[PDB]
Amino acid sequence: KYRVRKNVLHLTDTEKRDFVRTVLILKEKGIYDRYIAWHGAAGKFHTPPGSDRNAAHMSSAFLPWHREYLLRFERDLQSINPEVTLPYWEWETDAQMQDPSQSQIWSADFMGGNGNPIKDFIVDTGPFAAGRWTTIDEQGNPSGGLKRNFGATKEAPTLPTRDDVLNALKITQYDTPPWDMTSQNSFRNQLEGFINGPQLHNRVHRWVGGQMGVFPTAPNDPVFFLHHANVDRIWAVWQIIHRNQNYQPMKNGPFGQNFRDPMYPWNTTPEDVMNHRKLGYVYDIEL
């Protein structure tokens, strides 16, 4: 309840400077790379083998897995600078702008901006521009720079809307069998964005493009963490609203997806992270 995660648009100039500074230290120390790797590893861990479900997405663990991922990340930020917490990118409000690409999140003192089409969409502004920030491919090898290409896709020309968010929050069940990308009347599947997709979470990745447009390379872009903090906030809000609902499946789901199953690559279970307040943080909007 002490660590407050703030909306990016509410951050002071120094808060933004301190966050960026801290991420760059995590990168320099070699720590940031662990987060890129863990996310890639989980995505290749299929539950069960042969299924498209994996430890980190396309099934019920999507939400708790990322909650745990962000918790560890924030804890690493805190070790460097105890005043730094993980902010969230409220993309549904950016979606209301005439041009969401004019959002302050993409300023040169924060995330930096869109890709340069002359340079094949390499990002050349901000703290994470090519030449200031190195990237790796799916195999762990150097890839030579962060890329972004906002709204360039036929399937995701726009960010998800406030209405889209409110509509997901109306869903009563956390998830439903068969606990996959086809789950109907499922908050998890709705928020993940598969039904008539891409929507919500899947749509944001596709809208940003570049490394964010493909799962395994997505964390090369620091905005990955800001996006997932927003996803985590939306889940937190669903949890408050639907207080008598709990995680599903409680049992008999594939191993790695049940309430008390360890979430690869860690030993942490969904049960361990069900109460975000117990983990030591809250979102500003709760206060």
Peptide bond into 127 cis (omega under 30): no
Residue 28 annotated as binding site: no
Residue 164 annotated as binding site: no
Identify the CA nearest to 40 among candidates 253, 262, 199, 264: 264
Residue 132 annotated as binding site: no
Residue 242 annotated as binding site: yes
Is 89 within 8 Å of 207 (Cβ atoms)? Answer: no
Residue 138 annotated as binding site: no
Residue 39 annotated as binding site: yes
Residue 156 tokens, joined? 């995701």
Residue 227 annotated as binding site: no
Residue 155: strand, helix, or coil: coil
Question: Which H, E and C letters describe 19-54, residue by residue?
Answer: HHHHHHHHHHHCCHHHHHHHHHHHHCCECCCCCCCE
Residue 208 tokens, joined? 């940003």
Residue 173, exposed/middle/buried by CB under 10 A (0-12, 13-18, 19+)? middle
Residue 276 annotated as binding site: yes
Residue 18 annotated as binding site: no
Residue 53 annotated as binding site: no
Q: Which residues are within 8 A (CB) of 274 and not within 5 positions of it... i.e. 6 or more apart?
A: 64, 239, 246, 247
Residue 201: strand, helix, or coil: helix
Residue 155 annotated as binding site: no
Residues at the binding site for Zn(2+) are 10, 13, 39, 46, 52, 57, 66, 68, 92, 109, 120, 163, 201, 205, 228, 242, 276-277, 284
Residues at the binding site for Cu(2+) are 39, 57, 66, 201, 205, 228
Residues at the binding site are 10, 13, 39, 46, 52, 57, 66, 68, 92, 109, 120, 163, 201, 205, 228, 242, 276-277, 284
